Amino acid sequence: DGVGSSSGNWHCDSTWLGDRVITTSTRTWALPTYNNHLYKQISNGTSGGATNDNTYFGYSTPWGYFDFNRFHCHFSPRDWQRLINNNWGFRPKRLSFKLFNIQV
């Protein structure tokens, strides 16, 4: 693990094996500093014109998060077509996640 060594490769692919299909996707991301490194109480009441149906209390944090809860994060259009045109069903079994080639 050094400054001059990559800590991972680009894995983007799909393989169909029978009653299984494995999707793999890699992306490049960017993360800024959020909230000026702070935690902040955020709220919205019924003042001004804000209706009661929209009130809330919570917090914003200095953290970011990864999300891939969207099918196109894993299936290319063609793969999605291969899936829906030939199978009565499908479901997730297991996953691997990786963060690498980090640069600050």
Partner: protein
């Protein structure tokens, strides 16, 4: 040229015939070949099983491909099905070239 696979040793021709069954012959000998036969025909079932090898598609094309599909909207009858009269019909010719491949 009409399409298909050219074979030096194609599936063999399968010939079939009902054996002639003489109707009564004369009572005194005669040289002539019989020409009077019992009227008959045959019927039965026939089975053909063929094993085909498939060459799976290995494309990295990102966007969806063209695909043969049934029509979506309502219709008087179902394509590739029978009539109210029990007649089966093939509404259109269906080719084989939907997926794509680079040169």
């Amino acid at each position: 040229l009409m399409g298909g696979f050219g074979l030096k040793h194609p599936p063999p021709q399968i010939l079939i015939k009902n054996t002639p069954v003489p109707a009564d012959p004369p009572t005194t000998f005669n040289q002539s070949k019989l020409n009077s036969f019992i009227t008959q025909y045959s019927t039965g079932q026939v089975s053909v099983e063929i094993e085909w090898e498939l060459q799976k598609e290995n494309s990295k094309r990102w966007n969806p491909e063209i695909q043969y599909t049934s029509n979506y909207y309502k219709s008087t009858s179902v394509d590739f099905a029978v009539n109210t009269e029990g007649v089966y019909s093939e509404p259109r010719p269906i080719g084989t070239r939907y997926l794509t491949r680079n040169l």
